Every structure is written in C-alpha cells, then in structure tokens.
Design an enzyme around this catalytic site. Structure first.
Site, PDB file in Angstrom:
ATOM      1  N   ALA A  71      -3.440   1.234  14.279  1.00  0.00           N
ATOM      2  CA  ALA A  71      -4.652   1.267  13.450  1.00  0.00           C
ATOM      3  C   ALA A  71      -5.771   0.357  13.993  1.00  0.00           C
ATOM      4  O   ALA A  71      -6.773   0.131  13.303  1.00  0.00           O
ATOM      5  CB  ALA A  71      -4.317   0.897  12.012  1.00  0.00           C
TER       6      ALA A  71
ATOM      7  N   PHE B 115       2.541  -8.020 -10.304  1.00  0.00           N
ATOM      8  CA  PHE B 115       3.739  -8.856 -10.255  1.00  0.00           C
ATOM      9  C   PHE B 115       3.987  -9.446 -11.646  1.00  0.00           C
ATOM     10  O   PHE B 115       3.063  -9.521 -12.462  1.00  0.00           O
ATOM     11  CB  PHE B 115       3.587  -9.968  -9.209  1.00  0.00           C
ATOM     12  CG  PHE B 115       3.911  -9.529  -7.807  1.00  0.00           C
ATOM     13  CD1 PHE B 115       2.935  -8.965  -6.997  1.00  0.00           C
ATOM     14  CD2 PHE B 115       5.197  -9.675  -7.300  1.00  0.00           C
ATOM     15  CE1 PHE B 115       3.235  -8.558  -5.707  1.00  0.00           C
ATOM     16  CE2 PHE B 115       5.503  -9.271  -6.010  1.00  0.00           C
ATOM     17  CZ  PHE B 115       4.519  -8.713  -5.211  1.00  0.00           C
TER      18      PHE B 115
ATOM     19  N   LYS C 221      13.944  -6.692  12.240  1.00  0.00           N
ATOM     20  CA  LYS C 221      14.548  -5.866  11.186  1.00  0.00           C
ATOM     21  C   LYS C 221      13.596  -4.787  10.673  1.00  0.00           C
ATOM     22  O   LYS C 221      12.379  -4.974  10.638  1.00  0.00           O
ATOM     23  CB  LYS C 221      15.062  -6.726  10.016  1.00  0.00           C
ATOM     24  CG  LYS C 221      16.522  -7.143  10.135  1.00  0.00           C
ATOM     25  CD  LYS C 221      16.818  -8.443   9.398  1.00  0.00           C
ATOM     26  CE  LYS C 221      16.302  -8.425   7.966  1.00  0.00           C
ATOM     27  NZ  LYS C 221      17.202  -9.169   7.038  1.00  0.00           N
TER      28      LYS C 221
ATOM     29  N   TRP D 241       6.800  -0.243  -8.109  1.00  0.00           N
ATOM     30  CA  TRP D 241       7.887  -0.923  -7.437  1.00  0.00           C
ATOM     31  C   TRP D 241       9.089  -1.027  -8.362  1.00  0.00           C
ATOM     32  O   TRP D 241      10.208  -0.717  -7.957  1.00  0.00           O
ATOM     33  CB  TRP D 241       7.457  -2.313  -6.973  1.00  0.00           C
ATOM     34  CG  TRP D 241       8.486  -2.995  -6.121  1.00  0.00           C
ATOM     35  CD1 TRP D 241       8.682  -2.831  -4.779  1.00  0.00           C
ATOM     36  CD2 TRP D 241       9.460  -3.946  -6.554  1.00  0.00           C
ATOM     37  NE1 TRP D 241       9.718  -3.620  -4.349  1.00  0.00           N
ATOM     38  CE2 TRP D 241      10.211  -4.321  -5.418  1.00  0.00           C
ATOM     39  CE3 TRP D 241       9.773  -4.523  -7.793  1.00  0.00           C
ATOM     40  CZ2 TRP D 241      11.256  -5.249  -5.486  1.00  0.00           C
ATOM     41  CZ3 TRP D 241      10.807  -5.444  -7.858  1.00  0.00           C
ATOM     42  CH2 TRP D 241      11.538  -5.796  -6.715  1.00  0.00           C
TER      43      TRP D 241
ATOM     44  N   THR E  65       3.994   1.629  -0.980  1.00  0.00           N
ATOM     45  CA  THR E  65       4.708   1.827  -2.252  1.00  0.00           C
ATOM     46  C   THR E  65       3.798   2.465  -3.298  1.00  0.00           C
ATOM     47  O   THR E  65       4.194   3.432  -3.942  1.00  0.00           O
ATOM     48  CB  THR E  65       5.368   0.538  -2.839  1.00  0.00           C
ATOM     49  OG1 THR E  65       4.403  -0.231  -3.575  1.00  0.00           O
ATOM     50  CG2 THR E  65       5.997  -0.323  -1.750  1.00  0.00           C
TER      51      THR E  65
ATOM     52  N   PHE F 155      -3.652  -0.865   7.617  1.00  0.00           N
ATOM     53  CA  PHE F 155      -4.475  -2.057   7.379  1.00  0.00           C
ATOM     54  C   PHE F 155      -5.448  -1.893   6.202  1.00  0.00           C
ATOM     55  O   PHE F 155      -5.267  -1.025   5.353  1.00  0.00           O
ATOM     56  CB  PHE F 155      -5.224  -2.477   8.665  1.00  0.00           C
ATOM     57  CG  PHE F 155      -4.328  -2.737   9.854  1.00  0.00           C
ATOM     58  CD1 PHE F 155      -3.027  -3.211   9.694  1.00  0.00           C
ATOM     59  CD2 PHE F 155      -4.808  -2.537  11.139  1.00  0.00           C
ATOM     60  CE1 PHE F 155      -2.227  -3.454  10.797  1.00  0.00           C
ATOM     61  CE2 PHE F 155      -4.014  -2.780  12.242  1.00  0.00           C
ATOM     62  CZ  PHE F 155      -2.723  -3.241  12.073  1.00  0.00           C
TER      63      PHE F 155
ATOM     64  N   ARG G 121       3.229   7.882   7.616  1.00  0.00           N
ATOM     65  CA  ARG G 121       3.471   7.699   9.040  1.00  0.00           C
ATOM     66  C   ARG G 121       4.951   7.471   9.306  1.00  0.00           C
ATOM     67  O   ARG G 121       5.629   6.831   8.512  1.00  0.00           O
ATOM     68  CB  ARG G 121       2.681   6.493   9.558  1.00  0.00           C
ATOM     69  CG  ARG G 121       1.191   6.732   9.706  1.00  0.00           C
ATOM     70  CD  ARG G 121       0.470   5.416   9.918  1.00  0.00           C
ATOM     71  NE  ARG G 121       0.607   4.542   8.753  1.00  0.00           N
ATOM     72  CZ  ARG G 121       0.225   3.266   8.708  1.00  0.00           C
ATOM     73  NH1 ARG G 121      -0.316   2.673   9.769  1.00  0.00           N
ATOM     74  NH2 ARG G 121       0.390   2.574   7.591  1.00  0.00           N
TER      75      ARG G 121
ATOM     76  N   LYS H  65       0.847  -1.195   0.000  1.00  0.00           N
ATOM     77  CA  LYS H  65       0.000   0.000   0.000  1.00  0.00           C
ATOM     78  C   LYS H  65       0.886   1.250   0.000  1.00  0.00           C
ATOM     79  O   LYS H  65       0.724   2.147  -0.827  1.00  0.00           O
ATOM     80  CB  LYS H  65      -1.011  -0.032   1.165  1.00  0.00           C
ATOM     81  CG  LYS H  65      -1.407   1.327   1.734  1.00  0.00           C
ATOM     82  CD  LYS H  65      -2.842   1.367   2.250  1.00  0.00           C
ATOM     83  CE  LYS H  65      -3.161   0.257   3.240  1.00  0.00           C
ATOM     84  NZ  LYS H  65      -2.310   0.331   4.455  1.00  0.00           N
TER      85      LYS H  65
END
Ligand code: K
Ligand code: K
Ligand code: K
Ligand code: K
Lengths: 555, 552
Positions: free
Chosen positions: B271, B380, B103, B408, B71, B299, B92, B69
C-alpha cells in the site's frame, strides 16, 4: 494425433469416482478441481500389494517409452480385472518453459490431466521451494543475528532453489548492501527438484519421519569443521508445516481411468530417481498390484530403487519390467541415427549385450523375477524381435511385445499376463532382499561394489579430494548409509560415448558429499547439472492464453 | 478465546453451499478442498448487472497496535447479511513471509473473521506462487536474452526488473548473479523483493480479465538499452507465458466468514509502492454476484483510500457508494501525544488532540472525494461514555454520523448500527484529487496538499531528472503512487496529530508501466523484510496426524 490431442479427446472421470474404485470417500480426499485430489496419509495407520518396477536399458538421447510402458502395464492389469495403481513422478515446471513440456507417458498410455501435471499441479514443488528457501533464510539470519553456532560463512553448503531454468542463479554473491542487509557470501540456486528437501520428501514414511529427516540436514560447518544442522537452527517444524499438505499423494488417472498417483520427483543421479515412498506405500495399501518406475536405465534407477528406496523404506519389488526398443539396441550397437529405420541384425546383435547386462543385474545380482518389454515400433521386423527374444530366453527371461503406445491397455496384455505369472502366490523368500552392498562397509567399497557388479567396471579410482572427503565423512558418522552415484545415464561407464557393454574401464569419483537428511552419500563422477539453462528461443515465447483462459503452446 | 481457536471451533459450511447462496453451480467453480473454491472469471462478460453498492473500509492514521479495519470490514458485511442484504466481503490474501518471522494472524479478528484461517495464512490456493513464478520467469528470460547475444542491446547495469521470493530474506536484497565464467551467464547487480511487492502483483490486482492481464504484462519495463530506451516484457515475448502461469490464480478465491457470509480473498500488493487493494477482478466479481460489497484498502485513508479511488477506481471504472472510516479511542489518544501504557485510562484532553487526525480523514473523504462517509468506532470495554460522545460530537459537526461497532466480541450482531447507517447512506462522475493530463510534479503536489495537508512538495535533482525522462518517454498521463510512512500524514513517522506547515520530499521516481502508474518514493522503502533474532518459525511444529501448531 498428438499426445495433447489424444489427452484432450478423452472424457476424464471425476476424481471422486476414480477414488471410489480405491474405496476412498469424500472424507479421505482433498479436491483440487474436478480431476485431481490429495489422499489423506493418515489412512496408512489402519495386507499389501505386489510391487512392479519399470526400469529400462541404457537410454538414448530420445527415449524407449519407459513411462509409457509403466502406464500401459497398469492399464492392462486393470483390464484383466486386477485392482491396480500406477505410481509416477511429477515433472518439474522449469523445462516446460525452456524446451517444451510433454506427456506423462505417451500415445494412448498417459496419465492426465496433462496440462495441470506439467504446470503447478497441486503445488507440491512450490511447497518444497518455500521450505528450502526458508531454511536458507534461517541459516543467513542466524549468522546475521550474531552467529552463535559459529558458522563459517564460506562453508554453508545449503543452496537456494527456484523451479525455473535460470543459469543466472547458478553462481551468485548475496548478503551485500552494507551491515544492515546481510553478510556477503558465495551462494547459488539449484532447480527445486535437485534440493535435498525433494529427496527427503520422497523417502519419508510419514509426516513425523519427514520432520526428523529435515532436522538432520547439514546446512553448514562451523569454524573448527563440525556440521551444523537445520535441527540446530530449529527449522524442521516450519519446513514440515510448509510440507504438510504437499506430502499427501496426488490422485489422478490414466486415459482408461486406472487410478494413478503422481508424487515426488527427485534427480536420478544426485538422488534416487523414484516417486515418493509415501505414495508407493499408499498405492500398496489400496490396490492389489502397483506399477511404478525409476529414472534412467537399470544401472542407475533400479539400483537406487532397490539399494536406497526399498532398503530404507522396507519394500521389495515382486517383479521388474526391463523396457527396451529395437532402435535403442541398434544405436547401442553403433548404427547412428537416421540409419535406424532399416533392418540391421548385425547392429542389433551388437546392442543386445547391453540389455543382457541389465537383465543379468536384475536376475542374478538383485535376484528378482523379470520380463523384458519391447515397445514394438512399426519397422521392427519379425527377425529382429525374434533375435531379442532368443538372446533373452537363453538367460531364462521372457519377452513381452508392448504396443500400449498405439493400443492402450490392450497393447500390453501379454506383458500383464507375464507379470501375473511371475508374481504368482510365491512371495516366499523369507530371505529378505538381495542388495548390491551392505551398510557397514566403508564408503569406497560400496562405490566399488556398485561399479563392479552393476556397471561392470574393473575398478573405481578416487581423486585425493574425493578420498579426503570420504575420510572426513567416515569420521563424522556418515560411513554407514547408502551411496548414490552421480554419473551419466547414457553409458554403463562414466564416459557417455562408451556405448554397448563396455569392459576394461574404471569409474572415477571426483567429489563426495552427504545428504544427511535424505540418508545417503552422493558420489559425483565429474560434472552434474543442477540448474538447466534456457535455449536461444525459449518455449515460453510461443505459450499463450486466449480470452476464455485456454492455454496454447505448451506442447 | 484466541482467534485460531474460534476459527477452529466454528463448523464451516461446505464451500459448495456458500457458492449456491450466490447462484453458482458445480460447474462454475474449481474446488480446492472442502472449504475453498476458485470462481471462473468467464462469469463476468457473461451477462449484465445490475452492479452492487460498493462500500470502502478505511481508517485513521494507524498505530503499531492496529485499529481492526479488517475486522470492521468483515463485520459490516456480516451485519448487512443479517439485515437480509445479499453481501460479499472482499479482502487481500496475506503473504507467507511474515508468518514465519513474526507469526501469522487472523483474516480479521474475534468473531469477525474469514476462514479457513490456517490455509489463508499458508499456500491458500497457490496464487502467490504463480505470481512468484511469473516474476521469476521474466527475470530468467531477461538474462537469457542477454546471454544469447543481446539483440535488444540491453545495458546489463540498467535491468530494473527484480527477482522474487515470498520469504522474509534480507540476504537477497542485494546480490550479484550470473557468475562462474562464460558458460554460466553475465555478471550483474540484482536483488529479490518479497513477491507481493512485485509489479506482477500490482498488475494481477488491476487486471480486468485474462486478456487485460496479458496486455499489461507486455508493457512491463524490464530494462533499458545502451542508449536509454526502455525494453519491455513484450519485446522478450514473455507475456503469454506469464499469463499462462497466472491463468488459474486469476480466478478469485471464494471462502466464508464465521457466520457464512460469502467472502473473496484475492490479491495483495503493498500500500506504499502500490495501491494496497484486493484485486479488481474479485471486486468486480463480487459486485456482479451480490447487491452489497464491502472491501478495504491498506493503511490510513491518506494512503489506501486515496489510491483505491485515484488508482483502482479510476482505472477499473468503479465508484464507491459509501466509505467507512475506522477508529478507536486508544488510537486517537496515541495520536494526540499520550505516550502508550496509559492508553488505558480515560484522557479527554489527549483524545481531543487526536480527533483532528480523524477529522482530516473525514474531511478528505467527504469534501475532497465527495463521498458519503460513516465513522465506525471499534468500541473497547474500557472506553468511557464521555470519550465515545466526544468523538461523535466532533464528527456530527462535520455532518458525519458515528456507529459504535462491537463486531470483535459479538460478530454481525455488533455491526447492525453500522450496517443500517450504510444502507441509509446508500438510499438517500467521481471526484479525483487530480486529472491524468496534469504533469507528474503537479499530480504529486495535488495529493500532498489536498490529502496530507502539506504546504508544498520538494523534489531532489535526481527526482526532477527521473520525472523528466518519464515525461518524455510518454508516462506523464498516468496515476501517481506516493510511497511513504503510514504512521504519519507527513513523510516523518514521528509527526503524529494533524501536522501543519510541512513539506514532502520526493527522492526517487520510477514507473510500473504494466500496472499503469508512477511510483514516487519519499523515504526508505523496505521491499524485503528480514527475520528477527528468534523467528516464529522456530516454534512452528507438526505432529504425526499432520496438525500444525505454533503458527499464531
Ligand atoms: K509440474
Ligand atoms: K556456499
Ligand atoms: K498466504
Ligand atoms: K539491477
């Protein structure tokens, strides 16, 4: 005219022009607004200054204006055409909201911006808090996930931190809520600047030495008594990553635009009460004279500046300022407040031995050039000042009148000139530096060496608990490092009511632990507060912000 | 090429240049290094827009492997900028906690990123520390008041305020503090939440300006007295100091995309127990300084988009001009039962069983919220022409277009079709799910039925009592924030698809009186994540030059 009024009545110079005076460019600094910047520490691997130490006599409840003199001296050297840097500590945020904030310095001898330095500044203390608390959470995670290292839950000596004056967090039980939420253990929070992370932050030569020091932190002992380290837990990379930017010294400025570093701020009892080594070293690499200071009087601060900071960092002060006031001496001679505005040569005569003891320690034990700074108040008579000058001159030490509170750099030319005289191309001393004790001695003989030579104690007594702790530290390989003595600052003895120059007394060590990453042993002599409490009416209550975002009520 | 390598291989523009694109002088901003700045909030009241077109990015029901979302949010902005439209992306700020446990990650991904990526993932401009300090100051002040005599007559066992750290530390979820005898405080049960879960973060995010901040903090309920009455931060005179601690933090953080699109990164609440949006002040600042603003909510659209409209837009007085609903083919096949692993090979059956979830989100946006929607698909390479056509066909039958997004792989170039559709949607009174004057039960029923598609909502006896106490104490005219699983339109994470014939069960109701909404909990709510067996921290490292590695 308040310190805050004074500080707001002066147009500060854009920090890029202050940095210009040190030959730093846009590419050498990270700006934090218009009046603050962080200096890249990678400059330090591509001659060095004379280092001046500002210390003081045994402190009163109020003050002797040590930091004010430290700033005033640097401003004076600058006026005399010396490229100078004043290096100071960052105050913790906690007290600002309890018992009011205050100036870095005072009068016309300040480092600014005053408001930012008191608040978040460049976020050093927050980074330090995060690192401390990451370590703690990693210690508890390790126990929770199966405790491979076999940590005894009741023997984790690492503590958590916040930079708030919160007595409620001094003694807690955490890890509650059943098997999915931790494993119960006793714990507590210290004020961030009491953390070993802060002491380490201040003794690191560079980012690599920081990381290696952090790794040596003892966080707990296993069930057969062996120390467990942050290294064992693989925490040192993460902690250092969290402290990567923080470790860049903070460039700010005096009211007269002398370049100034504010960086680090450890305790002066359970640690060495100095600003950061990395900052001191940076200042010496960029200037011809550096002025800095250590906490409390010369029995604690300077002793630890020399026998801990200088020793481990490989530095040597070229001259020492011993700050004093006619009031503080008369208080030490037993005159009692409110009765101190009147002249009293008898009371002053009984207070001078304290000054003389501190002068003796600097000139005879540590064997350093020294000048005495009297911060002249208005009621200081001509005779009272003459008296301080005579007694000092008989030890062969000069007295400079300092009026930097009222006149800025102009009020400290006499001091500045004396410092130039004292440090005149005569470095010599291939000898090295005279320390109070040597490292290879047993722990009790260092404590004894300090207590006798510096405090003037007959001897040091030890409890059975203390003695046993020392023995176990000797065994574990911690018997060959400096010793930090934690006692009251208000007396040369460990009893705060003993004023003057006490004799026929002992110090009593009640507890001994190691700050293994910092590289020193802490020897407590009674009770040392690690987390201050809020008063009945906190200063927070009257701190406000208006429509336009201007803060009121900090001072 | 990894996200960090891309973020470190692109030469960034000095933030002063970025600021100039928006007409900001030296002057209007506080620099935090060369690539970050805080913009003065006094530029709001300043004059008068001329407000931007506001674009909301939301998504279908999320899977564990995210649908990108953020990206798409960054990419739609980069695209718009390439079409000559003055655009700001608003996002955010992420918390520090998870970076050391599992990570960190990019602000976005691929060639759709906001940067500097490392700084955003660490201390950034220090916003979360100020928040932590403000929260922890208030807690200290509550206890001090009790310790010093307890004039306000606080019941020590009803202090509902909780302390904060931005570490994933399970050890602090449940604690006892104030021990060590009379000189060290007063014994009570307590706990820490992760900082971004504090009401201070929700208030930070809903405040219109510094004066609204101060007044919201005053209304925080910290505890109850021994006869059931709420005690507030205002009673403790804490709001001035909290705001002083948050004075600089409240200025929005100006950064940039890889392509140099002005970006704000500011605020970051939960959220579930909160509304999952970036700050109002940053969105409002963006709408002031630009003609288009692209932002997002946490979300899926059942949580984030519902609250963005029903809480944020309602209280802030904003109105989104179009909504982007992000989805992927893989995510829909997962949602149609296809059990992982195979989420690679074509499956037009499983896709057709997933799509209804999409169509439910589209329905909620276009029919319940009555807003222009566009579905953007993060294409994709393994997506078949027929899979993509099936999604478009089903969406076109409801009147909504589909734009293929490849932001992307190609950056702004890959969001041109999406942006052109957004322009079209925004050239050709806000409808809320419920009214404020309705009772709490009925507002919770309204969200559950209309948005999740539940038959009804059940409440425990505890919930009904709690609700009643809040009705009587004068909290019944407030928005309601339903905390529940994001992985399902129900409150059962297992229920994938477009579930029918279910109910929601409200087990616990409390109030964030400062933030201005009721929190209604339906299941387990984790406010303090723990560390895994092998924390990411273990492999984070720094070298002599001060370069960090191991963060991603
Ligand atoms: K500070
Ligand atoms: K302990
Ligand atoms: K962050
Ligand atoms: K509680």
């Amino acid at each position: 005219k308040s310190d805050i009024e004074i500080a707001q009545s002066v147009k500060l110079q854009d920090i890029r022009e202050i940095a210009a005076k040190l030959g730093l460019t846009e590419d050498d600094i990270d700006l934090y607004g218009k009046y603050k910047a962080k200096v890249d520490y990678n400059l330090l691997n591509n001659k060095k200054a004379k280092l001046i130490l500002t210390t003081a006599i045994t402190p009163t409840p109020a003050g002797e204006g040590k930091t004010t003199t430290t700033i005033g001296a640097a401003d004076a050297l600058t006026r005399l055409g010396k490229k100078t840097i004043v290096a100071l500590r960052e105050p913790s945020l906690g007290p600002v909201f309890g018992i009011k904030g205050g100036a870095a310095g005072g009068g016309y001898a300040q480092v600014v911006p005053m408001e930012d330095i008191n608040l978040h500044f460049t976020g050093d203390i927050h980074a330090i808090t995060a690192a401390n608390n990451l370590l703690a959470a990693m210690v508890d995670n390790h126990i929770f996930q199966g405790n491979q290292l076999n940590i005894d839950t009741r023997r984790v000596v690492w503590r958590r931190a916040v930079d708030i004056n919160d007595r409620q967090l001094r003694f807690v039980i955490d890890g509650l809520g059943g098997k999915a939420n931790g494993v119960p253990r006793e714990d507590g929070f210290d004020i961030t600047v009491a953390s070993e992370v802060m002491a380490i932050f201040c003794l690191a030569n560079d980012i690599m030495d920081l990381k290696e020091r952090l790794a040596k932190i003892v966080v707990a002992y296993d069930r057969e008594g062996k120390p467990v380290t942050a290294g064992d837990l693989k925490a040192q990379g993460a902690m250092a990553a969290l402290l990567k930017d923080a470790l860049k010294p903070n460039l700010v400025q005096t009211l007269e635009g002398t370049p100034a570093f504010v960086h680090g701020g450890p305790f002066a009892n359970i640690a060495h009460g100095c600003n950061s080594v990395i900052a001191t070293k940076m200042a010496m690499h960029l200037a011809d004279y550096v002025v800095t200071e250590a906490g409390f009087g010369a029995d604690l601060g300077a002793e630890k500046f020399i026998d801990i900071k200088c020793r481990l960092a490989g530095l040597k002060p070229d001259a020492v300022i011993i700050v004093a006031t006619v009031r503080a001496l008369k208080y030490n001679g037993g005159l009692a407040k409110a009765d101190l505005e009147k002249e009293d040569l008898n009371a002053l005569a009984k207070g001078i031995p304290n000054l003389l003891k501190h002068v003796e320690n600097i000139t005879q034990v540590f064997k350093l050039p020294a000048v005495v700074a009297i911060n002249r108040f208005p009621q200081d008579t001509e005779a009272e000042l003459k008296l301080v000058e005579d007694r000092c001159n008989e030890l062969g030490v000069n007295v400079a009148l300092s009026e930097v509170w009222a006149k800025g750099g102009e009020g400290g030319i006499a001091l500045a000139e004396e410092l130039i005289r004292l440090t005149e191309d005569n470095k010599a001393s291939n000898k090295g530096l005279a320390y109070v004790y040597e490292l290879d001695m047993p722990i009790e003989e260092k404590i004894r060496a300090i207590s006798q030579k510096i405090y003037g104690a007959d001897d040091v007594m030890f409890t059975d608990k203390a003695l046993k702790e020392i023995a176990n530290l000797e065994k574990l390989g911690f018997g060959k490092m400096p010793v930090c003595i934690a006692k009251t600052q208000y007396s040369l003895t460990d009893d705060p009511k003993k004023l003057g120059r006490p004799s026929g007394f002992n110090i009593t060590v009640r507890d001994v632990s190691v700050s293994a990453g910092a590289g020193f042993i802490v020897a407590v002599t009674g009770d040392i507060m690690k987390m201050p409490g809020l008063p009945k009416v906190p200063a927070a209550e009257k701190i406000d912000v208006d429509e336009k975002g201007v803060i009121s009520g900090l001072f």
